[PDB]
Design a protein around this ligand. Sequence first.
Ligand SMILES: [Cl-]
Lengths: 179, 176, 179, 187
Amino acid sequence: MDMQHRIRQLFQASIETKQQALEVLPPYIEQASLVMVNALLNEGKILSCGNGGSAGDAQHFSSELLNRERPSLPAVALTTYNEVFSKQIRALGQPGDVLLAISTSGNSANVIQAIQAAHDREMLVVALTGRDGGGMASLLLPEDVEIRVPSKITARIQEVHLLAIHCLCDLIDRQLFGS
Amino acid sequence: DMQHRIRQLFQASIETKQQALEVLPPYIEQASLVMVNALLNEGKILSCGNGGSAGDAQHFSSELLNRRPSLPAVALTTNEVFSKQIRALGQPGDVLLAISTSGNSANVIQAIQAAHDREMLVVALTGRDGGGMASLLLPEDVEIRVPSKITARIQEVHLLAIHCLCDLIDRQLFGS
Amino acid sequence: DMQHRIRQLFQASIETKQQALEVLPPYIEQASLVMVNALLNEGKILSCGNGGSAGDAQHFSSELLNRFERERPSLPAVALTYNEVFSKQIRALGQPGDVLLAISTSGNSANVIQAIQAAHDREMLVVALTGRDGGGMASLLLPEDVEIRVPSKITARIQEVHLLAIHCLCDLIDRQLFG
Amino acid sequence: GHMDMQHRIRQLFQASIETKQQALEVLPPYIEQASLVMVNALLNEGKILSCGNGGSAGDAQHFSSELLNRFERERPSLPAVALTTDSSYNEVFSKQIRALGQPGDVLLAISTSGNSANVIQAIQAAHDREMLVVALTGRDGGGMASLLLPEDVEIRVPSKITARIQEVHLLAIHCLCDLIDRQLFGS
Ligand SMILES: [Cl-]
């Protein structure tokens, strides 16, 4: 009785959070995918990163796109001391590339450091966040895009992030190659 | 591009979770009792999956292991890649959490067989028609099949389903 | 002169190995019997390392378990992959009589030290691959544990002798179990 | 201790020692040459990509992680990155090389036999991006060696024994890093 209730409860919270997100996120998902499509078109790449339950999201986004029957898109997750991402971005990133930075709270020291490295290399940033945006939100420059899930709950934020990413991939293919 | 297309993807996501809500909860409940059972009997949970399911396997385990008290859940961390590790680490009673969008991942199929040889129970997160994984399941195993043929929809529901399992285990062992 | 330096590095590598040859073989033999005894008693080997010692740990377990380069039976050797990430996996997976292969070049890795503690707590024996003079962790070992301490302070030379030592461990395990 | 095991341990030590002594007599010119191509690439604002299969993968990641992260040693970070795997699958390296590689960059490619299809394909991808290749190999060099253009460098360990090739590879990698640091940051 309680367990079936709790399940229904979590399902409905997940669904309600997505309906809220539906009202506020589409313009930001559109701008991000556009920023990404323009970078690819100019022979740039996308580097993605995230901490913990966001790390899978960075690699899900990238593998989808890199490993393909549309053309392989140059999208690489960084993987494998808050400098782990930042150093790879300095090694790999060139002007006009795009950083996808994923953090449910926006407080990841190493994603914050990632965003500085991306700015130093003249890259645009697509930031996937939740809650109040955290420290990352405040570090975004005017040309950067923020996709902020309207929720405080870590697990609902993650659920909308997966969806957001699936939206970005889909809009990237439609814009580049066509429906 | 199209906001209209974004709303459309969001609406499709919502609709599948609604379809999933009408069919999955009793299985989600079963799996969780199976997992709480094994953990109370001093056992453990191993998880696995390929493609867009590997992260889910890790996300489940490292919630429970790393953090509440830590719970013995380990993700198999790389067609006998998983099967070999189950043989080595599995003990009678343990649970395998196996995740696949198609039900056709050859190494998770061999993961399921290895778990059976260990006298382990299997919880299978699947979609579509359940593939070769469904046909391997024994009566005491639990399928959680997403009523969708679309990979991206199954993945979205699989993450919700994994969040539920975690929640129900903590609910039963610790309470709320 | 770059030639002078290469031939100096090769000689330092050869010379460390020669001095390793004078202290190590008893401890390699003892380490391997411990591992063989555990496996014959239906046990398993868990292995762990940090930094450059981390390939070593994976290489050890990958070798025996997957058998990608030689055709003999698979052995339950498993590499482990926040000072508690190793501790917590050992606690979750280790059963009494199991063996931990613990690798580091300094002997000071916080997690590997805590891996040792988690191994003893689970009534496991430890084979410890170290260099320098073992320092800590090498002071945590109990009478039935085994240390293989490279007679060197140079990280690179220690890595080199570790790889050889692991190759000796795997080889004698097979030699004792399959002749 | 018991004789056989003591015999086996000491015979392996001796074979490792003897393989290194043989390697010493033929590898230095190619090791120097390799480190020169790497240094020249970095001086021209290049980067190094590394890859390897099975037991070589560790070497690949060891090389680039030391150079880039600088845990073990406090000197400047160098743009050296290991190519990942983790979820046909023979294109995992080449797909990344085509995304990340630039004209002038260097691929350090590691294989003991030289026949792994994904490293063979990595070499092609590097060539298509106008990158130079440093190939750590053994035995006869395999298919990999057959693909090397004249600006490339091969470091072929003079052994047919996997374990022996792996040990010399680790040494080669330690020399390359030493030589890169010497040339850039002082002997
Ligand atoms: Cl589909």
